[PDB]
Amino acid sequence: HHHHMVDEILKLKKEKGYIILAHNYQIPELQDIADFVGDSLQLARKAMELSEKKILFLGVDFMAELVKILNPDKKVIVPDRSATCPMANRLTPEIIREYREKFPDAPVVLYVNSTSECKTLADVICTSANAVEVVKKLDSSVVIFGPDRNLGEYVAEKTGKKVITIPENGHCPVHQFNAESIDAVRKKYPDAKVIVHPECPKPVRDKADYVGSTGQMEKIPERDPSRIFVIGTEIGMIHKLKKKFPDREFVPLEMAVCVNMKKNTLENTLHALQTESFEVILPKEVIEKAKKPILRMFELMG
Ligand SMILES: O=C(O)c1cccnc1C(=O)O
Ligand code: SF4
Ligand SMILES: [Cl-]
């Protein structure tokens, strides 16, 4: 059944010239059939290097749209067109326009987990991995930041700059661990290092040894020799990590599952390659507009 499905997927992939890009939060079966697994930007950038012009993207809509923005002349298909980010969808163009009005000297820094429509209105895009570098390099000492309040406050702490978060209480449900969980693993594994996402609430960040994006997580065992790592993010990272460091132990801080990331399965992936749908299409003017704050991001980096 799974061999059945996987064999067919690996068959139709080669036969129809698709590259498969999976996000770190995908079920391990989909990570294993992917050509590259990574975070949002890493996958879009990799896609820019490829000679192939057909991409099957395994993640959520905004990420597939990011791939499309940076790779306009490539066919990008997703297996579940409803896979989306509810946090991102809470920030609106009306809210952006309201805050630019109130704070005209504050650049609009937009987190990558944001709608493409929102990107068109942003001054610069950022990721969890570069948000600190990006905001530090902007001239202004005050920024408008969205849609994640936690990442925004983390950026404030690290840059010393004033960070106006939008919308009200923008948060990712997957990363709302409680600090008690850290207290518990510390007693259970006294020599374990705890790594948590910057999207986590402040108490959780303050009690961890490391705060990092998924991409940063993947690099910490290259320099930290510890046997055991407690990982405070979506469960799919545990599989990525174990694969890259089979010599260490990776313990989820808690079971945390993104419902939308899990909408992608072997079955609907197979259907995607069969039908060559669903294609990610954006208006050309949306692409042209959203590219500006993304290119601005590359420039500051680098
Ligand atoms: O940019 C991403 O892919 C991303 C999206 C949501 C949460 N975390 C990450 C990460 O890389 O750590
Ligand atoms: S894991 Fe969080 S930040 Fe990523 S798509 Fe799901 S709700 Fe959004
Ligand atoms: Cl292209």
From Swiss-Prot:
GO terms for biological process, alphabetical: 'de novo' NAD biosynthetic process from L-aspartate
Q: What is the effect of changing Y25F?
A: Retains weak activity
Q: How is the cofactor bound?
A: Binds 1 [4Fe-4S] cluster per subunit.
Identify the InterPro entries for this entry: NadA, NadA_sf, Quinolinate_synth_type2
Sorted alphabetically, the Gene Ontology cellular component annotations on this record are: cytosol
- Could you say which cofactors this protein requires? [4Fe-4S] cluster
Listed A to Z, the keywords are: 4Fe-4S, Cytoplasm, Iron, Iron-sulfur, Metal-binding, Pyridine nucleotide biosynthesis, Transferase
* Primary localization: cytoplasm
- Localization, UniProt: Cytoplasm
Query: Molecular function terms in GO for this entry?
Result: 4 iron, 4 sulfur cluster binding; metal ion binding; quinolinate synthetase A activity
What is the regulation of this protein's activity? Inhibited by 4,5 dithiohydroxyphthalic acid (DTHPA) analogs, which bind to the catalytic iron site of the [4Fe-4S] cluster.
Residues that coordinate or bind iminosuccinate: H23, S40, Y111, V112, N113, S128, H197, P198, E199, T214
Q: Which PANTHER family does the annotation name? A: QUINOLINATE SYNTHASE, CHLOROPLASTIC (PTHR30573:SF0), QUINOLINATE SYNTHETASE A (PTHR30573)
Q: Which family does it belong to?
A: Belongs to the quinolinate synthase family. Type 2 subfamily.
UniProt-recorded name of the protein? Quinolinate synthase
What species is given as this protein's source?
Thermotoga maritima (strain ATCC 43589 / DSM 3109 / JCM 10099 / NBRC 100826 / MSB8)
**Gene name of this polypeptide:** nadA
